[PDB]
Design an enzyme around this catalytic site. Structure first.
Site, short mmCIF file in Angstrom:
data_model
loop_
_atom_site.label_atom_id
_atom_site.label_comp_id
_atom_site.label_asym_id
_atom_site.label_seq_id
_atom_site.Cartn_x
_atom_site.Cartn_y
_atom_site.Cartn_z
N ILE A 9 -3.18 -1.77 6.73
CA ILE A 9 -3.31 -3.21 6.93
C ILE A 9 -2.69 -3.89 5.72
CG2 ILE A 9 -4.90 -5.13 7.22
CD1 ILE A 9 -4.88 -3.63 9.68
N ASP A 10 -1.69 -4.72 5.96
CA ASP A 10 -0.94 -5.35 4.89
C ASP A 10 -1.77 -6.50 4.31
OD1 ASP A 10 1.18 -3.60 5.21
OD2 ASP A 10 2.14 -4.88 6.72
N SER A 11 -1.14 -7.33 3.49
CA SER A 11 -1.80 -8.52 2.95
C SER A 11 -1.58 -9.75 3.83
CB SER A 11 -1.31 -8.79 1.53
OG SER A 11 0.10 -8.64 1.43
N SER A 52 -1.22 -9.53 7.07
CA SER A 52 -2.21 -9.27 8.11
C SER A 52 -3.62 -9.60 7.63
CB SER A 52 -2.13 -7.82 8.57
OG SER A 52 -2.48 -6.93 7.53
#
Lengths: 50, 98, 77
Positions: free
Chosen positions: C36-38, C40
């Protein structure tokens, strides 16, 4: 039959990410886009036709 | 704008992000396809038609990638609930229980 | 009451990226396991704030890395 089907979807995810970016910090993004627009506009008044 | 109007009921922020994820891709695909089809006229020998092709292609590239993907949704999100005046809209729905 | 918070967050993040709610547990982090990115992360924060009315300020998302941390933050507020 099976002719119109989606496969390897990677566009709506990226565009939801840019949506998240554009909702959280609208001020900076708006000013940046306006800056590029002004870079475009300033060349206009000097324009000659042939 | 029509797609945005469609899904504005579950808040304005969620509406903007969903409208992006749903129709930004479509508009960008159409814009890119037509823009580059018009950029292929650069290699044309005739200068007037090459000029027209390049002008239109660059115009659509700038329009689709900057003015329409970052500038108009930003104005919408910034102005918030005053983007639908004189209609009255809530900037976010009533909180729901967990 | 933490379980209902976990359920809500599971539904929202399943909406975002497509991770089944059964898989989400408070004993695992975001970036290194769920990938999970930033951006996101701001997706999740904005959507949960808009739907259930909890405001998680900027420059505080990075301070939490695990689902347990998120539920602790929500139930502390």
């Amino acid at each position: 039959g099976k002719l119109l089907e989606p496969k390897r979807m990677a566009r709506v995810r990226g565009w939801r990410k840019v949506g998240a970016a554009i909702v959280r910090w609208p001020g900076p993004i708006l000013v940046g886009a306006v800056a590029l627009a002004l870079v475009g506009l300033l060349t206009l008044p000097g324009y000659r036709t042939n | 704008v029509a797609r945005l109007k469609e899904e504005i009921h579950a808040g304005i922020n969620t509406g903007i992000i969903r409208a992006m994820g749903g129709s930004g891709s479509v508009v960008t695909a159409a814009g890119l396809v037509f823009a580059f089809t018009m950029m292929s006229f650069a290699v044309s020998e005739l200068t007037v038609m090459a000029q027209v092709g390049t002008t239109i292609g660059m115009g659509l590239l700038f329009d689709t990638l900057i003015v329409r993907s970052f500038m108009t949704p930003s104005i919408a999100a910034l102005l918030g609930k005053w983007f639908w005046w004189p209609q009255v809209v809530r900037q976010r729905p009533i909180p729901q229980p967990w | 009451t933490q379980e209902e918070i976990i359920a809500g967050l599971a539904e929202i993040i399943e909406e975002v990226t497509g991770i089944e709610p059964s898989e989400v547990t408070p004993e695992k982090s975001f970036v290194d396991d769920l990938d999970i990115d930033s951006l996101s992360m701001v997706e999740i924060a904005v959507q949960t704030e808009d739907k259930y009315g909890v405001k998680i300020p900027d420059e505080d998302l990075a301070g939490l890395r695990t689902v347990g941390d998120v539920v602790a933050y929500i139930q502390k507020l």
